[PDB]
Structures are given as C-alpha cells and as structure tokens.
C-alpha cells in the first residue's frame, strides 16, 4: 500500500538551496515513474520534475530547469530534489507522487503529505518612493 | 503548454444535488483526462483516469465524460465528505498541465449571493 512520506523542506533565505526528501513504500519503487509537483498560496498545481525508473531520464518545466535537481535512490528509494537559486516563485507545498503506470504521460496513483518551502526573508525592501 | 481551464471557479450547492464541473484543453488531448479532489489540507486524490475510468475503490457517483477538448465531471449526490477542489489534469504532452480548479461547496448562509 503507497506510503509517500516526505520530510526537509523549512524557510529558506532567498539564494538559498533545499534538499527535500521523499521515501516510497508497497510498491516497487524502482519500476516507477516518479514525479514532484508543487502548490503555490493562492495557485493550482505545477508538475516540477519527473524521473524514469532507472534514475534514466529526467524532465523539468521551464520555471525550474537548471536550479532544481532530481535525483533517486533506488537502493532505499527514495526521492530527492535538490533545489538551488531559491526564488520567491518557489514557495509552495511540495508533493512527491507516484505515476499511476510506469510512463511519464500518466495522471498521478498516489501523492505523499506535502512539505512547505517558504523562500522568504522579509518580502520586499524598497524605500525610493 | 497545453492551457487547461476550469468552469467554473467556485460553487456552491446541497446535499443530494447533482453538479458539473467543465474542464476544457486548448490541443486535442485524445483523452488523456485525470480528474483530482483536494479536501483542505489534503493531497489530491485520483478520481477519474482516462477521461472515464474511476480509480478504485471510487464511489460510483463521481463520473467523468468527454474527449478532445471538452470534459465533464459529474457528481449525481451531494455529499459532504465531497466538500473540496476538483483538479483535471492532461496527459497529452510535457509540461504535465493542472487546470486552475473548481471548489465545490455546501449553502451557506449568505443570499445564495442572488440579488
């Protein structure tokens, strides 16, 4: 039965890089597609990354590309996403999910509890008017 | 990407009613339809797949209908454990693309706003 359970996301300074983790179970992991998806205060769902069984092939969306980094280990599986260059755009509550079927092009099984990322110092500081 | 949208935004009915909610794609996206419910505080949960299929163990009282462009989800009775915000969700092409959501919601006091 999926258990995806996800920890490491906290505050973070602007600049700043994360490691979320997710750990997956009753299921062979190592068959699966996985993904991880996010949700914005006051926004609907974008799908970040996904990763191909193997730790083959990996792809992002446009939005993240080089600042986030996907990575499985298949010998505990588990997930990672590293996320470098912290932006404010990132804050959201993070999702790790299963791919229904082994495949990119699939709607999502089973979603994990959801860890928050909050990319905030003090909003914004400007004085010149 | 692929634009999905959500008709509509937010509603709000009663126990035992029967409720629609549009999900429109800008390709044609054969029918590669996911539909999710997300109680506050919850993950989404797979409803529908494959524009028709429900997940299992899905009542059979969320339905999902349509192919191309237009799609349809049909709740036939209100329930209150459906309180939530409904998701659709192409599988077409990457970026995999969320529609905007439609939150369903019970009457609630304020003049069902009708003026």
Not at chain 1, 65 to 71: A, E
Not at chain 1, 85 to 97: H, K, Q
Not at chain 2, 62 to 80: A, E, R, V
Not at chain 2, 102 to 110: G, H, Y
Request: aromatic fraction near 10%; charge should be neutral; charged fraction near 15%.
């Amino acid at each position: 039965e999926v258990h995806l359970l996800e920890s490491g996301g906290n505050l973070v300074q602007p600049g700043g890089s994360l490691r979320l983790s997710c750990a997956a179970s009753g299921f062979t992991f190592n068959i699966f597609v996985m993904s991880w998806v996010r949700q914005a205060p006051g926004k609907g769902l974008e799908w970040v990354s996904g990763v191909f069984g193997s730790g083959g092939n990996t792809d992002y969306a446009d939005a993240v590309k080089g600042r986030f980094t996907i990575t499985r280990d298949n010998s505990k599986n588990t997930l990672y996403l590293q996320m470098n260059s912290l932006r404010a755009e990132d804050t959201a509550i993070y999702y790790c999910a299963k791919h229904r079927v082994s495949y990119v092009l699939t709607g999502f099984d089973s979603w994990g509890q959801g860890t928050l990322v909050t990319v905030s110092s003090g909003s914004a500081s400007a004085p010149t008017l | 990407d692929i634009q999905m949208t959500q008709s509509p935004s937010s509603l709000s009915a009663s126990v035992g009613d029967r409720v629609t909610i549009t999900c429109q794609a800008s390709q044609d996206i054969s029918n590669y339809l996911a539909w999710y419910q997300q109680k506050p505080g919850k993950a989404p949960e797979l409803r529908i797949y494959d524009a028709s299929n429900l997940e299992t163990g899905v009542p059979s009282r969320f339905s999902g209908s349509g192919s191309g462009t237009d799609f349809t989800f049909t709740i036939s009775s209100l329930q209150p454990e459906d309180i939530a915000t409904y998701y659709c969700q192409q599988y077409q092409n990457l970026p995999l693309t969320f529609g905007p959501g439609t939150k369903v919601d019970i009457k609630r006091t304020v003049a069902a706003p009708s003026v």
